[PDB]
Design a protein around this motif. Structure first.
Motif, PDB file in Angstrom:
ATOM      1  N   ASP A 244      19.300  -4.883   5.860  1.00  0.00           N
ATOM      2  CA  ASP A 244      18.991  -5.514   4.587  1.00  0.00           C
ATOM      3  C   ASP A 244      19.256  -4.537   3.445  1.00  0.00           C
ATOM      4  O   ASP A 244      19.506  -4.934   2.310  1.00  0.00           O
ATOM      5  N   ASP A 245      19.202  -3.252   3.766  1.00  0.00           N
ATOM      6  CA  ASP A 245      19.455  -2.188   2.809  1.00  0.00           C
ATOM      7  C   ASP A 245      19.856  -0.988   3.647  1.00  0.00           C
ATOM      8  O   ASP A 245      19.202  -0.681   4.636  1.00  0.00           O
ATOM      9  N   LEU A 246      20.929  -0.313   3.261  1.00  0.00           N
ATOM     10  CA  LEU A 246      21.405   0.832   4.025  1.00  0.00           C
ATOM     11  C   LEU A 246      20.549   2.087   3.906  1.00  0.00           C
ATOM     12  O   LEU A 246      20.747   3.053   4.648  1.00  0.00           O
ATOM     13  N   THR A 247      19.609   2.081   2.968  1.00  0.00           N
ATOM     14  CA  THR A 247      18.713   3.214   2.783  1.00  0.00           C
ATOM     15  C   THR A 247      17.486   2.864   3.615  1.00  0.00           C
ATOM     16  O   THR A 247      16.773   1.917   3.307  1.00  0.00           O
ATOM     17  N   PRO A 248      17.228   3.625   4.683  1.00  0.00           N
ATOM     18  CA  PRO A 248      16.091   3.377   5.569  1.00  0.00           C
ATOM     19  C   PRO A 248      14.715   3.736   5.028  1.00  0.00           C
ATOM     20  O   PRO A 248      14.576   4.506   4.086  1.00  0.00           O
ATOM     21  N   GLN A 249      13.699   3.158   5.655  1.00  0.00           N
ATOM     22  CA  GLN A 249      12.314   3.416   5.299  1.00  0.00           C
ATOM     23  C   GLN A 249      11.731   4.364   6.345  1.00  0.00           C
ATOM     24  O   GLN A 249      12.157   4.346   7.496  1.00  0.00           O
ATOM     25  N   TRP A 250      10.768   5.190   5.953  1.00  0.00           N
ATOM     26  CA  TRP A 250      10.163   6.125   6.889  1.00  0.00           C
ATOM     27  C   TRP A 250       8.816   5.666   7.435  1.00  0.00           C
ATOM     28  O   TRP A 250       8.025   5.055   6.725  1.00  0.00           O
ATOM     29  N   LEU A 251       8.562   5.983   8.702  1.00  0.00           N
ATOM     30  CA  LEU A 251       7.312   5.611   9.351  1.00  0.00           C
ATOM     31  C   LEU A 251       6.278   6.751   9.372  1.00  0.00           C
ATOM     32  O   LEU A 251       5.094   6.513   9.595  1.00  0.00           O
ATOM     33  N   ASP A 252       6.721   7.984   9.143  1.00  0.00           N
ATOM     34  CA  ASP A 252       5.809   9.131   9.097  1.00  0.00           C
ATOM     35  C   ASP A 252       6.398  10.223   8.208  1.00  0.00           C
ATOM     36  O   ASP A 252       7.601  10.489   8.249  1.00  0.00           O
ATOM     37  N   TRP A 253       5.543  10.849   7.409  1.00  0.00           N
ATOM     38  CA  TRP A 253       5.978  11.896   6.498  1.00  0.00           C
ATOM     39  C   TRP A 253       5.492  13.268   6.905  1.00  0.00           C
ATOM     40  O   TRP A 253       5.671  14.230   6.166  1.00  0.00           O
ATOM     41  N   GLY A 254       4.868  13.350   8.078  1.00  0.00           N
ATOM     42  CA  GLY A 254       4.373  14.623   8.568  1.00  0.00           C
ATOM     43  C   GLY A 254       5.456  15.405   9.288  1.00  0.00           C
ATOM     44  O   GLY A 254       6.586  14.939   9.395  1.00  0.00           O
ATOM     45  N   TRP A 255       5.108  16.586   9.791  1.00  0.00           N
ATOM     46  CA  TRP A 255       6.055  17.453  10.490  1.00  0.00           C
ATOM     47  C   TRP A 255       6.335  17.093  11.947  1.00  0.00           C
ATOM     48  O   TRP A 255       7.440  17.320  12.446  1.00  0.00           O
ATOM     49  N   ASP A 256       5.333  16.546  12.628  1.00  0.00           N
ATOM     50  CA  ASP A 256       5.467  16.246  14.045  1.00  0.00           C
ATOM     51  C   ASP A 256       5.227  14.808  14.471  1.00  0.00           C
ATOM     52  O   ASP A 256       4.094  14.378  14.682  1.00  0.00           O
ATOM     53  N   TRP A 257       6.321  14.074  14.603  1.00  0.00           N
ATOM     54  CA  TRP A 257       6.287  12.686  15.022  1.00  0.00           C
ATOM     55  C   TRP A 257       7.734  12.372  15.340  1.00  0.00           C
ATOM     56  O   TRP A 257       8.377  11.563  14.679  1.00  0.00           O
ATOM     57  N   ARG A 308       2.651  -3.473  11.960  1.00  0.00           N
ATOM     58  CA  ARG A 308       2.797  -4.868  11.555  1.00  0.00           C
ATOM     59  C   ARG A 308       3.774  -4.894  10.392  1.00  0.00           C
ATOM     60  O   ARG A 308       3.886  -3.922   9.652  1.00  0.00           O
ATOM     61  N   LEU A 309       4.493  -6.000  10.242  1.00  0.00           N
ATOM     62  CA  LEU A 309       5.484  -6.132   9.181  1.00  0.00           C
ATOM     63  C   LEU A 309       4.961  -7.008   8.051  1.00  0.00           C
ATOM     64  O   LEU A 309       4.622  -8.166   8.265  1.00  0.00           O
ATOM     65  N   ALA A 310       4.919  -6.454   6.845  1.00  0.00           N
ATOM     66  CA  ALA A 310       4.411  -7.188   5.697  1.00  0.00           C
ATOM     67  C   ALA A 310       5.464  -7.458   4.634  1.00  0.00           C
ATOM     68  O   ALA A 310       6.206  -6.567   4.238  1.00  0.00           O
ATOM     69  N   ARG A 311       5.519  -8.699   4.170  1.00  0.00           N
ATOM     70  CA  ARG A 311       6.472  -9.080   3.137  1.00  0.00           C
ATOM     71  C   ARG A 311       6.092  -8.400   1.826  1.00  0.00           C
ATOM     72  O   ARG A 311       4.918  -8.223   1.530  1.00  0.00           O
ATOM     73  N   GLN A 312       7.090  -8.005   1.049  1.00  0.00           N
ATOM     74  CA  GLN A 312       6.845  -7.357  -0.229  1.00  0.00           C
ATOM     75  C   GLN A 312       7.483  -8.201  -1.330  1.00  0.00           C
ATOM     76  O   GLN A 312       8.348  -9.034  -1.061  1.00  0.00           O
ATOM     77  N   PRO A 313       7.044  -8.018  -2.583  1.00  0.00           N
ATOM     78  CA  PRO A 313       7.632  -8.806  -3.669  1.00  0.00           C
ATOM     79  C   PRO A 313       9.118  -8.500  -3.754  1.00  0.00           C
ATOM     80  O   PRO A 313       9.518  -7.342  -3.688  1.00  0.00           O
ATOM     81  N   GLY A 314       9.933  -9.535  -3.897  1.00  0.00           N
ATOM     82  CA  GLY A 314      11.364  -9.321  -3.969  1.00  0.00           C
ATOM     83  C   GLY A 314      12.011  -9.766  -2.674  1.00  0.00           C
ATOM     84  O   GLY A 314      13.237  -9.809  -2.558  1.00  0.00           O
ATOM     85  N   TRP A 316      11.555  -8.304   0.505  1.00  0.00           N
ATOM     86  CA  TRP A 316      11.873  -7.273   1.486  1.00  0.00           C
ATOM     87  C   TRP A 316      10.637  -7.034   2.348  1.00  0.00           C
ATOM     88  O   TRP A 316       9.541  -7.495   2.017  1.00  0.00           O
ATOM     89  N   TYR A 317      10.813  -6.312   3.447  1.00  0.00           N
ATOM     90  CA  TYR A 317       9.718  -6.062   4.374  1.00  0.00           C
ATOM     91  C   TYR A 317       9.460  -4.592   4.709  1.00  0.00           C
ATOM     92  O   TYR A 317      10.378  -3.781   4.789  1.00  0.00           O
ATOM     93  N   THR A 318       8.194  -4.250   4.908  1.00  0.00           N
ATOM     94  CA  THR A 318       7.839  -2.877   5.230  1.00  0.00           C
ATOM     95  C   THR A 318       6.815  -2.853   6.358  1.00  0.00           C
ATOM     96  O   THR A 318       6.113  -3.838   6.583  1.00  0.00           O
ATOM     97  N   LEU A 319       6.738  -1.732   7.069  1.00  0.00           N
ATOM     98  CA  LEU A 319       5.787  -1.591   8.171  1.00  0.00           C
ATOM     99  C   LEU A 319       4.494  -0.936   7.696  1.00  0.00           C
ATOM    100  O   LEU A 319       4.493  -0.160   6.740  1.00  0.00           O
ATOM    101  N   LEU A 320       3.391  -1.267   8.360  1.00  0.00           N
ATOM    102  CA  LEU A 320       2.084  -0.707   8.031  1.00  0.00           C
ATOM    103  C   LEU A 320       1.472  -0.149   9.311  1.00  0.00           C
ATOM    104  O   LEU A 320       1.506  -0.796  10.354  1.00  0.00           O
ATOM    105  N   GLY A 441      -2.241   2.387   4.997  1.00  0.00           N
ATOM    106  CA  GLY A 441      -1.338   2.725   6.083  1.00  0.00           C
ATOM    107  C   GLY A 441       0.160   2.635   5.873  1.00  0.00           C
ATOM    108  O   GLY A 441       0.913   2.696   6.839  1.00  0.00           O
ATOM    109  N   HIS A 442       0.613   2.491   4.635  1.00  0.00           N
ATOM    110  CA  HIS A 442       2.046   2.428   4.389  1.00  0.00           C
ATOM    111  C   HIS A 442       2.639   3.822   4.598  1.00  0.00           C
ATOM    112  O   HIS A 442       3.806   3.970   4.968  1.00  0.00           O
ATOM    113  N   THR A 443       1.829   4.844   4.343  1.00  0.00           N
ATOM    114  CA  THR A 443       2.273   6.215   4.525  1.00  0.00           C
ATOM    115  C   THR A 443       1.318   6.980   5.435  1.00  0.00           C
ATOM    116  O   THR A 443       0.103   6.928   5.268  1.00  0.00           O
TER     117      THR A 443
END
Ligand SMILES: OC[C@H]1O[C@@](CO)(OC[C@H]2O[C@](O)(CO)[C@@H](O)[C@@H]2O)[C@@H](O)[C@@H]1O
Ligand SMILES: OC[C@H]1O[C@@](CO)(OC[C@H]2O[C@](O)(CO)[C@@H](O)[C@@H]2O)[C@@H](O)[C@@H]1O
Length: 480
Positions: A244-257, A308-314, A316-320, A441-443
């Motif tokens: 849906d967009d070539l720029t990916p979304q991240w599931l974790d921002w920590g060092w180890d995952w 879980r996948l949640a719809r966002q305004p516009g 698009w979808y993001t994971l929580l 839980g988005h981040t």
């Protein structure tokens, strides 16, 4: 580790997507007797996603023929021909020990994934390898691993994604044995990662719409991004994947995952998925850790999270993300501390090594607010979780351990609205880790931290103004 999965002994590496049989989740993971040495697939069961029962090796290392990552499915309809309900797995192995020959080998089990028999001929040959001659071609041939298998309900066939150098390949099959090559998935920003342990699945969002997700472990450190797991929502038509967009979304921002995998939950397979990752980073994974000398094993997985996948305004979808629900059954004590305002620093009257702490922080003029965990009474050691600028940071810097230092990878951060004047935090602390679930839980930020025996305190801090710390609750977690 009190509530994080660790191997009985040896080196722990990439987990493999769990399969559901015998009423439990069957987790597989790369295991080696030597640190970062050659190994194979070991087995562990879990019914709640918190406690695991280890069963040993299931896909053993063979002379100069190790077993790398892949995936497994329950051939419920017996499409593979090994029997109805057979657990069929594909795993990458370097034929003849040659890296440029790494290809996909099939293994099958008739007892629910407890014992596997091997099929001698690879089901997806590394053709490029044998043709590779130039230094470019062999590098490409040396990155053809981690098959992730998914049953495409719409087309009634198997689809499989494999990680390659800065791109991913797809194959379809009616029987898990004969594979037909499809079109690759390319993405613009190669400074992101080269696709290892790709993930492929379908999930239903909170609005009832179906969506595909293609993800993988990356390495975007060079451009300031995580080295964890990134995904692209989209659709698979049987020949190619449309992001849906070539720029990916991240599931974790920590060092180890790293090497994270996801699987459908037993209770709600279409809307709720479970996920677990190896709490380590290749920037320093090949080394000895504290548990080696003290217990003879190296490595642990993260807490299992629900997705879980949640719809966002516009549109698009993001994971929580959120900790696996069953963790609540391992709580042995719940301590509440009165709300308080702090301007500078204050030490909470609580000490422990394995627990979950939840709290809210509200401020106005303060430029830095936060909490410190694993605080030693000599005041020198601690891990800081706080908000500064546009960052929700986790700084394990003051927790560096002599001879096991994690420097320079000390301060991890997730994006947060710089205009926010309050935030909710749910923090999981264990003997060798810290996992922060921010807001809804988005981040999330997951990291291994080498705590010392006396690193049991907790303190609150603000810089530039007072902050109200409310809803403080600390839940001690136990073995069972
Ligand atoms: O060098 C990689 C680059 O080439 C493309 C096509 O332009 O595909 C290469 C790749 O496709 C296969 O045929 C199947 O996966 C491989 O055998 C071959 O190496 C790009 O998609 C890719 O980025
Ligand atoms: O111990 C709290 C105290 O330390 C300071 C600076 O000395 O901040 C620490 C903390 O803030 C960051 O710099 C923000 O990016 C983190 O990286 C670091 O861990 C004070 O601001 C704070 O009062």
């Amino acid at each position: 580790a009190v509530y994080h999965m660790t191997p009985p002994s040896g080196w722990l590496c990439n987990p493999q997507r769990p399969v559901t049989t015998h009423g439990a989740y069957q987790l597989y993971y790369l295991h080696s007797d030597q640190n970062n040495g050659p190994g194979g697939w070991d087995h562990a069961s879990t019914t709640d996603g918190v406690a695991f029962t280890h069963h040993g090796t299931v896909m053993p290392l063979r002379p100069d023929f190790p077993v790398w990552s892949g995936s497994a499915v329950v051939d419920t309809a017996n499409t593979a021909g090994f029997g109805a309900g057979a657990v069929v797995a594909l795993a990458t192995q370097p034929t003849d020990g040659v890296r440029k020959y790494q290809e996909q080998y099939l293994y099958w089990s008739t007892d629910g994934g407890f014992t596997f028999t091997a099929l001698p001929d690879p089901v997806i040959v590394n053709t490029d390898g044998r043709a590779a001659t130039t230094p470019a071609e062999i590098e490409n041939a040396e990155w053809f691993r981690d098959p992730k298998i998914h049953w495409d309900t719409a087309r009634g066939e198997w689809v499989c994604v494999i990680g390659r150098l800065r791109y991913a390949a797809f194959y379809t099959s009616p029987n898990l044995r004969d594979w037909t090559l499809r079109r690759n998935f390319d993405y613009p920003n190669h400074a992101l990662g080269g696709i290892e342990c790709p993930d492929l699945f379908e999930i239903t969002a909170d609005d009832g719409t179906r969506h595909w997700v293609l993800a993988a472990s990356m390495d975007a450190y060079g451009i300031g991004l995580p080295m964890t797991y990134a995904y692209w929502t989209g659709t698979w038509d049987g020949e190619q994947f449309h992001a849906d967009d070539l720029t990916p979304q991240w599931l974790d921002w920590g060092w180890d995952w790293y090497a994270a995998v996801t699987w459908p939950s037993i209770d709600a397979p279409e809307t709720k998925r479970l996920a677990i990752a190896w709490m380590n980073n290749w920037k320093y994974a090949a080394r000895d850790v504290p548990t080696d000398a003290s217990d003879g094993y190296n490595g642990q997985n993260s807490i299992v999270r629900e997705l879980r996948l949640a719809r966002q305004p516009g549109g698009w979808y993001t994971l929580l993300s959120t900790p696996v629900a069953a963790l609540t059954n391992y709580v042995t004590a719940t301590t509440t501390l009165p709300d308080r305002t702090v301007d500078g620093s204050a030490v909470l009257p609580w000490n422990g090594r394995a627990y979950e702490i939840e709290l809210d922080i509200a401020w106005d003029t303060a430029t830095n607010v936060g909490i410190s965990v694993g605080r030693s009474p000599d005041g020198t050691r601690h891990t800081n979780i706080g908000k500064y600028g546009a960052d929700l940071y986790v700084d394990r810097g003051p927790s560096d351990l002599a001879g096991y230092s994690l420097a320079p990878y000390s301060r991890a951060a997730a994006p947060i609205d710089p205009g926010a004047r309050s935030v909710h935090l749910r923090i999981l602390v264990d003997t060798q880790s810290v996992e922060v679930f921010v807001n809804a839980g988005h981040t999330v930020l997951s990291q291994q931290v080498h705590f010392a025996e006396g690193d049991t305190g907790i303190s609150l801090y603000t810089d530039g103004g007072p902050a109200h710390f409310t809803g403080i609750v600390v839940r001690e977690i136990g073995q069972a």
